[PDB]
Design a protein around this ligand. Structure first.
Ligand SMILES: CCCCCCCCCCCCCCCCCC(=O)O[C@H](COC(=O)CCCCCCCCCCCCCCC)COP(=O)(O)OCC[N+](C)(C)C
Ligand SMILES: CCCCCCCCCCCCCCCCCC(=O)O[C@H](COC(=O)CCCCCCCCCCCCCCC)COP(=O)(O)OCC[N+](C)(C)C
Ligand SMILES: Oc1ccc(Cl)cc1O
Ligand SMILES: Oc1ccc(Cl)cc1O
Ligand SMILES: [Fe+3]
Ligand SMILES: [Fe+3]
Lengths: 257, 257
């Protein structure tokens, strides 16, 4: 039951700008009646396909985080995306993310670092909620065949704010091509792809949490993210060990609540 | 199964402008995350309530007709609205619109005029599709209690392009306040009202049809139409007879197909 405290005055100004802007694009490009019928049917399709969270997060949410970005001094944020789930099972500072026997076959990714405040003091009782896709680009709880907490966890950072999280390296994400979001994209010759990414919500007692994503230097779609959610500050350059595992360190800087 | 011949190049440019514009409004007004969740839930509600045609026609379609307005030299057009139905039963040049025993109690409106071309030559085989709401502001086929062609007809203009159509005078229209469209309006202190109006599609053999609406001089909401669909060229000034009926004449000027 979602709410916001927006005064009628504010909404009216937003509505005026949003609707005026759309209406101007129509006048600009000479949007015809047949094209208008196509837009109306496609908005119906979007909701009938359950793709409002998907369409909105891909095309709109980057600007919402960009707003929040201004008011923030810590680690760069990025969009949540639609694939977040609360209360993923807790795990200790040093852990391995829950995975299938399939996932065990993929080159491992060892993610290390520390949660700290703005001055660099480590934070006790910090939490790292991590979620990402498997090598097949699917999310648990958004794929029937997967264990419901595959590659999802609540990492409990130690008394010093540190974690050593062993996972696999995520595959790039492709947005279902079959639906209206993918229809919108195929019809303009765009591409339905996101670079490979880790999702992280990072919290601490008395701190303003951070929702962020982490990408990979080599990675494809790196310079053409369809959700426009990539920032260079969030690109990891993992180095590979003689065990053949990929090793990366990244620290989280939380703002005060 | 609705389609348009829009090249990927065009859609991409439209998409770029539409999405950029929205994204700018977000950056402009500092659209927060809670407000974003409210917008996402409301887009889901709109489609779940079957109010995409309603929301679009009220807030977007005026600009689509404004485009078509440029390419046209005949009678001013206006939006279709969501309440149009094809194949309304035919009636002769001089007729009375189908109505209930209730409607017979309302002051009658006698609508007369002629369908002509750009030079003022009358057009044989011209059709006047007329639809409007009853004094209770409901449309037939969008209200269970009404006969399915209440205040809907296909008037067959005579060999000379003339019609004398007796109906009642429509009541102002109020957009359902209970749904997401009305929620969007109540939440900004807007008003959910349209001035009283007749709907007309006017066609002739070899002519580009006209979808238009006709309003009434005294009428309330006349200068504040929520669908922004009012034009001064479409305001009727009916004069009343000694039978106590309201009499108005209006001619349709069709463009060539
Ligand atoms: C093709 C159309 C799409 C574009 C539409 C442009 C208009 C966008 C503005 C609509 C924002 C949606 C808010 C209306 C819902 C409020 C009523 C409601 O039930 O929410 C209430 C919440 O209580 C409220 O009154 C909140 C006020 C609405 C604040 C939402 C503003 C968000 C604007 C987002 C604009 C981003 C695009 C630029 C739920 O309680 P039940
Ligand atoms: C909050 C989000 C709302 C704002 C969204 C902004 C983006 C608007 C642009 C999307 C237009 C929708 C067209 C996508 C559907 C095409 C695929 C399809 O199935 O239609 C096809 C039709 O074949 C096509 O390829 C038509 C190309 C799409 C042309 C539609 C352009 C209309 C743009 C309207 C913009 C008005 C707002 C400014 C149906 O065949 P089945
Ligand atoms: O995996 C994802 C797919 C689409 C979006 Cl918008 C965000 C994601 O995080
Ligand atoms: O009766 C009507 C109600 C709403 C709209 Cl947008 C148009 C109409 O014609
Ligand atoms: Fe993702
Ligand atoms: Fe109407």
């Amino acid at each position: 039951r979602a709410t916001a405290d927006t005064s009628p005055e504010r909404l009216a100004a937003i509505a005026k700008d949003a609707l005026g802007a759309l209406n101007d694009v129509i006048l600009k490009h000479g949007v015809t009646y047949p094209e208008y019928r196509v837009f109306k049917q496609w908005l119906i399709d979007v909701g009938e396909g359950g793709e409002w969270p998907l369409f909105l997060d891909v095309f709109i949410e980057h600007s919402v985080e960009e707003v929040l970005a201004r008011s923030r001094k810590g680690t760069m944020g990025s969009i949540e995306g639609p694939y977040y789930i609360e209360n993923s099972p807790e795990l200790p500072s040093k852990c391995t993310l829950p995975m299938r026997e399939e996932d065990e076959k993929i080159t491992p990714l060892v993610f290390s670092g520390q949660v700290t405040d703005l001055d660099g003091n480590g934070l006790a009782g910090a939490k790292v909620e991590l979620w990402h896709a498997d090598n097949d680009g699917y999310y648990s709880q958004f794929a029937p065949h997967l264990p419901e907490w595959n590659l999802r966890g609540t990492i409990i950072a130690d008394e010093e704010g540190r974690y050593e999280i062993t996972t696999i390296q995520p595959a790039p994400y492709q947005i279902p091509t079959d639906g209206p979001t993918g229809q919108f994209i195929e019809a303009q010759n765009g591409h339905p792809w996101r670079p490979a990414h880790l999702h992280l919500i990072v919290s601490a007692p008395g701190k303003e949490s951070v929702t962020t994503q982490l990408y990979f230097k080599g990675g494809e779609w790196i310079d053409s993210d369809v959700a426009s959610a990539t920032k260079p500050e969030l690109i990891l350059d993992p180095k590979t060990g003689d065990d053949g595992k990929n090793y990366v360190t990244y620290n989280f800087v939380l703002d005060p609540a």
